[PDB]
Amino acid sequence: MQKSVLEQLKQVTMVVADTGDFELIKKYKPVDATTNPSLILKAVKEQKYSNLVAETISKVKANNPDLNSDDLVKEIAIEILVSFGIKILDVIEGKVSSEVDARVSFNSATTIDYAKRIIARYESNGIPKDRVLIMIAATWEGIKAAKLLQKEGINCNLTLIFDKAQAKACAEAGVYLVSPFVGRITDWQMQQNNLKTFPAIADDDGVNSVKAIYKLYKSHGFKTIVMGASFRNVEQVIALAGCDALTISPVLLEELKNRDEHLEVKLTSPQISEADFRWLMNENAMATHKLAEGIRLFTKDTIELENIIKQNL
Amino acid sequence: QKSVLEQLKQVTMVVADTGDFELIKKYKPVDATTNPSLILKAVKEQKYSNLVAETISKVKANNPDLNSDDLVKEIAIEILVSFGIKILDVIEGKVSSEVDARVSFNSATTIDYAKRIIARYESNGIPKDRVLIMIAATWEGIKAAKLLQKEGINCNLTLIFDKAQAKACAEAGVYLVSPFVGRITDWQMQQNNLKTFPAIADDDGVNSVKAIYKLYKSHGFKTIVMGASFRNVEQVIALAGCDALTISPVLLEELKNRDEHLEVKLTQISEADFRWLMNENAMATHKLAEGIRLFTKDTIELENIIKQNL
Ligand SMILES: O=C(CO)[C@@H](O)[C@H](O)[C@H](O)[C@H](O)COP(=O)(O)O
Ligand SMILES: O=C(CO)[C@@H](O)[C@H](O)[C@H](O)[C@H](O)COP(=O)(O)O
């Protein structure tokens, strides 16, 4: 019963596919999947699912002849987000992550409203909320929004986690899952230290970040799921075998599928006030920069999606 | 022929950026600014070791109830005030004194620290009109300044790297803003490994202050625009006509010794809005945070010096 590294990983970690390409999701059979604004933009622009995109735009237009261009564009954007999520849910047993508009990242109330709008759109298609994770950037405001959403039974994926303080604050808020990044932390490490080659696993700041969060969570008995995200190579993924969950790009899933060696299982202070959180984040130059950058990048891709929608009106 | 320094004073309030008060006299600035790094420099170089020793003795005597940690904190405030008092003896205007950078994300502790500085000045016979409380321009610092201004305490909002950030300060009714120049140019040079300074027209730091000045003038904001952080005299000269400019003693000396003609060049936001606009500015996001970290490092070093002298 010898198995590939991918199949072995599934025994010790919840394998999640990081893509909007639902057909690819099929050849890897992950439990859950994650979409994000950049992945949705790629799914909209690529030829593969051009029919689905055109149909979604046409349907929303036909069913909302009274809405102005601006309101119509936002309606179409959320419908596209949800349409890809539904196609993904049709091919997996688990949940799909759908991200709120990045432009609401510093407003808890508008984050809550957008989250509820996403959930209502899934519900109108017969998808229960228990199959969806609302993805929210882990700014203080996003964590506050998630805290309230969880109280209403809406599970959240707190993303763009770069510091153990966010992770701790998210756990303290009772969120369903956190997505600490790995690759982007390693990117900063290489640029800051002028590293010509990729660091050894023991020295990889990204890998170590997830390990520290996992250790923190287990020692405190937190039930929030730790899902490593953002990977540069298969070695970083393999290094976190045993983590609660790992969301992995199709390119890397294919690499894992084709490897056959045994997979070694590697994974087996006061409450945070707003001022404390902000201080701790300020102390971390990398996290300060990367959280902000992540929000800007998703915003750029969401604005491009809006422009594309407007071009097809 | 008038020196560039003399010409600058005709169109801009010249301010000395130093805690080394004996150097101030020869430039005759209107106001002066200290900051945590400048206070540390003055203490480390030991020219004012007697002032430091006398301040430590006084605070101990007047505070028999404080433990070691609390005593050091009180001495740090009194040192800030002692330097300010000495500066006020040699200038006609105001002196800026900065709150502990460690309170930058707490409006309440910022307010009380500011009030403590003012109370120490008052106890030493200095009226509050002669003092500006410096506060980093985080949202929390701006909210603290809004309350302080209502209570008659004038504030200097510092570590300003973005125009929307400066607008929010003006909307809070602050007395003065300190938009930085040199640190913005540093970011620009680092981004592209530039070995030479950019042309003035292309200098992001100079352009930031020009943009803030233009906004304030067109909108009628009464907050004073004071450019700060300079790498060379050319950046100072480029902003001639600005409301105020705070300048190092080295650059004041350079201006004093230049005699060419000086061309005069310069003649609401919610919390969520503010945070969004800052986030859109990679440089400002980085530099504001960096400034707080650097001032914190220098405040900790000052505390360590105090501890060694108890
Ligand atoms: O965090 C999640 C889902 O939880 C992912 O979709 C996440 O956004 C992506 O892994 C990252 O944005 C990818 O970043 P990068 O590795 O391409 O720099
Ligand atoms: O903003 C004020 C006073 O209002 C200044 O004291 C300001 O802190 C200093 O000019 C800067 O910190 C100097 O930084 P740098 O030019 O040495 O990088």
Tab-separated table of N, CA, C and O and ligand atoms in Angstrom, chain B residues 17 33-35 38 134 156 158 178 180 183 226 228-231 246 295, ligand 2:
chain	number	residue	atom	x	y	z
B	17	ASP	N	16.531	72.062	14.893
B	17	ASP	CA	16.234	70.659	15.224
B	17	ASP	C	17.400	70.114	16.031
B	17	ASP	O	18.345	69.500	15.489
B	33	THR	N	12.973	72.230	18.015
B	33	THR	CA	12.376	70.917	18.210
B	33	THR	C	13.381	69.910	18.751
B	33	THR	O	14.544	69.909	18.322
B	34	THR	N	12.949	69.142	19.741
B	34	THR	CA	13.739	68.069	20.251
B	34	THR	C	12.946	66.843	19.848
B	34	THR	O	11.791	66.942	19.440
B	35	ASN	N	13.571	65.692	19.929
B	35	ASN	CA	12.869	64.464	19.638
B	35	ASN	C	13.635	63.425	20.426
B	35	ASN	O	14.660	63.738	21.024
B	38	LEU	N	17.332	63.125	19.368
B	38	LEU	CA	18.117	64.325	19.659
B	38	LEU	C	18.351	64.487	21.158
B	38	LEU	O	19.428	64.951	21.567
B	134	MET	N	4.926	66.790	20.968
B	134	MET	CA	5.104	66.005	19.738
B	134	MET	C	4.525	64.627	19.919
B	134	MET	O	4.746	63.947	20.936
B	156	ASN	N	2.348	69.063	18.039
B	156	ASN	CA	3.187	68.918	16.834
B	156	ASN	C	3.045	67.472	16.395
B	156	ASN	O	3.528	66.552	17.053
B	158	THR	N	3.948	64.495	14.278
B	158	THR	CA	5.156	64.136	13.577
B	158	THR	C	5.064	62.812	12.836
B	158	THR	O	4.028	62.160	12.843
B	178	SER	N	4.564	68.066	11.111
B	178	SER	CA	5.943	67.877	10.696
B	178	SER	C	6.057	66.799	9.603
B	178	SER	O	6.442	65.636	9.874
B	180	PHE	N	7.842	64.790	6.896
B	180	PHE	CA	9.239	64.470	6.685
B	180	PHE	C	9.616	64.532	5.198
B	180	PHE	O	8.817	64.216	4.309
B	183	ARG	N	13.572	61.208	4.885
B	183	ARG	CA	13.289	59.767	5.001
B	183	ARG	C	12.473	59.286	3.811
B	183	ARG	O	12.565	58.138	3.424
B	226	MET	N	5.372	72.364	8.827
B	226	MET	CA	6.802	72.451	9.129
B	226	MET	C	7.571	71.267	8.543
B	226	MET	O	7.539	70.152	9.072
B	228	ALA	N	10.490	68.737	7.943
B	228	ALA	CA	11.496	68.182	8.838
B	228	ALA	C	12.231	67.052	8.130
B	228	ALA	O	11.679	66.462	7.191
B	229	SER	N	13.420	66.722	8.628
B	229	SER	CA	14.285	65.630	8.114
B	229	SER	C	14.875	66.044	6.792
B	229	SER	O	14.196	66.070	5.760
B	230	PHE	N	16.142	66.430	6.810
B	230	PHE	CA	16.796	66.882	5.602
B	230	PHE	C	18.135	66.207	5.397
B	230	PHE	O	18.885	66.025	6.345
B	231	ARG	N	18.422	65.833	4.159
B	231	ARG	CA	19.698	65.179	3.807
B	231	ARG	C	20.755	66.162	3.353
B	231	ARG	O	21.959	65.867	3.474
B	246	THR	N	12.172	72.861	10.112
B	246	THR	CA	13.059	72.522	11.258
B	246	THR	C	14.306	71.856	10.684
B	246	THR	O	14.217	70.913	9.894
B	295	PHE	N	12.514	55.651	17.480
B	295	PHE	CA	12.390	56.509	18.676
B	295	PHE	C	12.303	55.655	19.923
B	295	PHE	O	12.837	56.028	20.964
C	2	LIG	O1	9.778	66.470	13.125
C	2	LIG	C1	10.625	66.917	13.888
C	2	LIG	C2	10.292	68.002	14.835
C	2	LIG	O2	9.005	68.543	14.534
C	2	LIG	C3	12.058	66.496	13.874
C	2	LIG	O3	12.635	66.624	15.202
C	2	LIG	C4	12.237	65.081	13.299
C	2	LIG	O4	11.987	64.108	14.337
C	2	LIG	C5	13.658	64.882	12.772
C	2	LIG	O5	13.932	65.902	11.804
C	2	LIG	C6	13.855	63.559	12.082
C	2	LIG	O6	13.605	62.466	12.992
C	2	LIG	C7	15.270	63.423	11.556
C	2	LIG	O7	15.424	62.162	10.909
C	2	LIG	P1	16.646	61.916	9.902
C	2	LIG	O8	16.640	63.049	8.918
C	2	LIG	O9	17.895	61.918	10.776
C	2	LIG	O10	16.332	60.586	9.248
